[PDB]
């Protein structure tokens, strides 16, 4: 399983039409659930209980977003609508160009995702933890919008 | 992070107190759980085995509904008859004066 | 330094799922920009669409993959900027990559690669031939498309 | 593809017949040149030896510019002065209100 170099970009237009940035790099890992591919797109956080088969017409997000899903301690939801792979699959069906799980509270998720390696999704499914995870989350909760660039070297 | 049984900094509400309904709120990038007394406009309740849950009001030119197919406020240009909006009021009921409703 | 470009047409369904169509095409990474993979909404820029002489320009959402069909260099004998300049200018206005259609002006390839000393942070790709025809046709024919550019 | 000295399927007009105004039209993904007699509404001309181009009228409160700093048409209600747009005409120019001007 390869290393996922992720950059999260904050951007602001100036008056002249040009852009200024700020860019936080993190590390993660590409799962075998998904392809080994770089991906870039606006980040969209997805609550874990908000990725399910069950809903007949879910809300619509522009094609080519990057999901971010903070997983919670596995016992806080014992009868989940879908497994962590199912959730990944939804995201991508709904147009995620990649999905990043934060697995800090749920390190078992990793092995589950990798047990999806026959039938892997066409798009990348990265996971992040620890300090790398804390960063991503801080940005998500605190800032308005952000762009992820995930590289596979 | 309120009305909440389980609760996290990043996901808001994860479990509601039982007579409260779970709603996924988008605030820009973020999507977090809220535990609400009543569903907000455009949504309606469901009290359920997995959860008590706020579903999307799926109904014809109508902002708010109570149920699966009972509309409350239609969007104007509609005539609310027996909970389903319509084009005209049907033969039997009439568009009210200064009302958006049938008889 | 080969650029593997995919152009992706997409439609939502009633379910809220997407279906797509994807055209793969090939170009090269100019040494004028970083040798990095890139993905974004394609935005076409007219060659003159990229000139320094405006105090404020119209604003595109950060993250776009500009495309520029270059013309025979005599159609503008004295350009507002070089290609290098136009490329820089695009990235300053937030383009995440820049793809040049150099078919009608292949020495831009050289002019461009002259930037290898002060290179842009983002990729600058050039296409031509069939690859460029496919790119231009889609751009002409459709409302939107997502470019994925890869460095493998 | 008219008004046009040079012209391409891919970029539309590339240079304009000398009296006419070069305009970038946005149309989905496309950006191509038009050569116009009048800059369209919301725009104004910037005639030059090299060429004439249209520019976005960016006067706060104004609809159509004659030029960068001079508004032709204020939006609904507003008051006109030095061809700027106003809520009410400031001190030292008595707003002849009927007319939506100052004096």
Author numbering:
A (entry chain A): 53 to 205
B (entry chain B), D (entry chain D): 40 to 142
C (entry chain C): 54 to 205
What sentences appear in the manuscript?
Rspo (R-spondin, also roof plate-specific spondin) proteins are evolutionarily conserved from fish to humans and have well-documented roles in a broad range of developmental and physiological processes resulting from enhancement of canonical and non-canonical Wnt signalling. ZNRF3/RNF43 specifically targets these Wnt receptors for ubiquitination and turnover, hence reducing Wnt signalling responses. Direct extracellular interaction with Rspo proteins inhibits ZNRF3/RNF43 activity. Here we report a molecular level analysis of the ZNRF3/RNF43 ectodomain structure and its interactions with Rspo proteins.
By using a combination of heavy atom and molecular-replacement-based phasing strategies, we determined multiple crystal structures for Xenopus (x) Rspo2Fu1–Fu2 (highest resolution 2.2 Å), xZNRF3ecto, zebrafish (z) ZNRF3ecto and mouse (m) ZNRF3ecto, (highest resolutions 2.4, 1.6 and 2.0 Å, respectively), plus complexes comprising xZNRF3ecto–xRspo2Fu1–Fu2, mZNRF3ecto–mRspo2Fu1–Fu2, mZNRF3ecto–xRspo2Fu1–Fu2 and xRNF4F3ecto–xRspo2Fu1–Fu2 (at 2.1, 2.8, 2.4 and 2.7 Å, respectively). The crystal structures of the ZNRF3ecto–Rspo2Fu1–Fu2 and RNF43ecto–Rspo2Fu1–Fu2 complexes revealed a 1:1 interaction between Fu1 of the Rspo2Fu1–Fu2 and a single ZNRF3ecto or RNF43ecto chain. The first, extensive, area of interaction involves hydrophobic interactions interspersed with hydrophilic (complementarily charged) patches contributed by the first two β-hairpins of the Rspo Fu1 and the region immediately carboxy-terminal to the β3 strand of ZNRF3ecto. The Met-finger at the tip of the second β-hairpin of Fu1 nestles into a pocket formed between the β3 strand and the αC–β7 loop of the ZNRF3ecto, which is lined with hydrophobic residues (I95, I191, V192, A198). The αC–β7 loop is a flexible region in the unliganded ZNRF3ecto crystal structures and moulds to interface the RspoFu1–Fu2 M68 in the complex. The acidic region of the β3–β4 loop (immediately adjacent to C104 of the disulphide bridge) becomes more ordered in the ligand-bound ZNRF3ecto structures, probably as a result of electrostatic interactions with a positively charged patch on Rspo Fu1. For all ZNRF3ecto–Rspo2Fu1–Fu2 complex structures we determined (from five different combinations of species and crystal forms), the dimer found in most of the unliganded ZNRF3ecto crystal structures reoccurs. The overall assembly thus comprises a 2:2 complex of ZNRF3ecto–Rspo2Fu1–Fu2. The 2:2 complex resembles a crab with the ZNRF3ecto dimer forming the body from which the two Rspo2Fu1–Fu2 ligands diverge, without interacting with each other, as the pincers. Notably, the β1–β2 hairpin shows less conformational variation in the liganded ZNRF3ecto dimer structures, always maintaining a tight embrace, consistent with the Rspo2Fu1–Fu2 interactions contributing an indirect stabilizing effect on the dimer via the β3–β4 loop.
